[PDB]
């Protein structure tokens, strides 16, 4: 569990850094827990170098019973769907010709409940595409109507990972709408872009790392099941400086320390954060390959013998789309004015797993 969360956060940072490299000025957002869950299911069906490469990239080296750890996180998180406007949908769609192993199905029935599905890519492509789109549409309460668009599924698709996640935030402490106003978001020391800036004064856990010149704040969502942590540089900087700080200072160990409330003090904070909605689709294949995942995607070299005796099977495509919407809806003294670029995570407080991981670079 603790071993698992640490694996998940380490992988989350690795992937985030890959995404940052790909889009340095972009508003990165992904759901690392979804990708870690999906890929751990694939690892159950893999063997040899395929299984070991997944484990290494996902940092599973020191984790015993990975599927049961995910069982618990998925359980916790599925209950949260009923309280929060939140869905984290993970599906592994496999073609009929895979003839899934019985041991694989029974091994994964409880830990990855509903996440594994057989479909007919080979002989019924357009029907299957409609079925997947519509199934994901209902699973995400109407939010993602066409998950398969701007990516491909084709009649040779063997295994398909779909992650689709959304969260419409509801704070523990609501922002007063009347104090939300348009401000120049400071892109860097000279350049500006307009943004709806939310404002309140309330008590929050806040950290204040002088050494890395960083303020961290915990902003709890209703009933404290999820919190957003904002890591905000104390001074506006050039984008090169900021991207170098991420590159050199951010690691899973440091992130965990910086965002640990045990290091944080209760403060009355004059708080300013942007009102924002971010929706991002990513192609993880390229990034996963960079991390070391080579055997996964090769029909010639992959060993998926734990799930299928069919030849030429591999992870065909990974789809990963996330939408996050942040609004007003909901004796130390300090200021947190996030009107310049910051990193944010949304943590499941119980397990400490990162649910969403992002960079806010511009409105």
UniProtKB/Swiss-Prot annotation:
Subcellular location, record wording: Secreted, Extracellular space
PROSITE patterns the UniProt entry points to: SERPIN
Region forming the signal peptide: none
Protein name, UniProt field: Serpin B5
UniProt keyword terms in alphabetical order: Glycoprotein, Secreted
Lineage: Eukaryota, Metazoa, Chordata, Craniata, Vertebrata
Glycosylation sites: 99, 133, 188, 349
Entry keyword annotation includes Transcription regulation: no
SMART domains, per database record: SERPIN
């Amino acid at each position: 569990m603790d071993a698992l969360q640490l694996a998940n956060s380490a992988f989350a940072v690795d992937l985030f850094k890959q995404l940052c490299e790909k889009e340095p000025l972009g508003n990165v957002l992904f759901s690392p827990i979804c990708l870690s869950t999906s890929l751990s299911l694939a690892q159950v069906g893999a063997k040899g170098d395929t299984a070991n490469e997944i484990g290494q990239v996902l940092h599973f080296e020191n984790v015993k019973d990975v599927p049961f750890g995910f069982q618990t996180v998925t359980s916790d998180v599925n209950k949260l769907s009923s309280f929060y406007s939140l869905k984290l949908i993970k599906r592994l769609y496999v073609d009929k010709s895979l003839n899934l192993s019985t041991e694989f199905i029974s091994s994964t029935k409880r830990p990855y409940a509903k996440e594994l599905e057989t479909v007919d890519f080979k002989d019924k492509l357009e029907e299957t595409k409609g079925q997947i789109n519509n199934s994901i549409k209902d699973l995400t309460d109407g939010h993602f109507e066409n998950i398969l668009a701007d990516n491909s599924v084709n009649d040779q698709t063997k295994i398909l990972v779909v992650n689709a996640a959304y969260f419409v935030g509801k704070w523990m402490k609501k922002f007063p709408e009347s104090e939300t106003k348009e401000c120049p978001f400071r892109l860097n020391k000279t350049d500006t872009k307009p943004v709806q800036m939310m404002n309140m004064e309330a008590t929050f856990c806040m950290g204040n790392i002088d050494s890395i010149n960083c303020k961290i704040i915990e902003l709890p969502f209703q009933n404290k099941h999820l919190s957003m942590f904002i890591l905000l540089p104390k001074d506006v900087e050039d984008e090169s400086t900021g991207l170098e700080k991420i590159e050199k200072q951010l690691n899973s160990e440091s992130l965990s320390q910086w965002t640990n409330p045990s290091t944080m003090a209760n403060a009355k904070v004059k708080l300013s954060i942007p009102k924002f909605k971010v929706e991002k689709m990513i192609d993880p294949k390229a990034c996963l390959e960079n991390l070391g995942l080579k055997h996964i995607f090769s029909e010639d070299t992959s060993d998926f013998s734990g799930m299928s005796e069919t030849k030429g099977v591999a992870l065909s495509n990974v789809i990963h789309k996330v939408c996050l919407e942040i609004t007003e809806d909901g004796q130390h003294k300090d200021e947190l004015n996030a009107d310049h670029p910051f990193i944010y995570i949304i943590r499941h407080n119980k397990t400490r797993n990162i649910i969403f991981f992002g960079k806010f670079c511009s409105p």
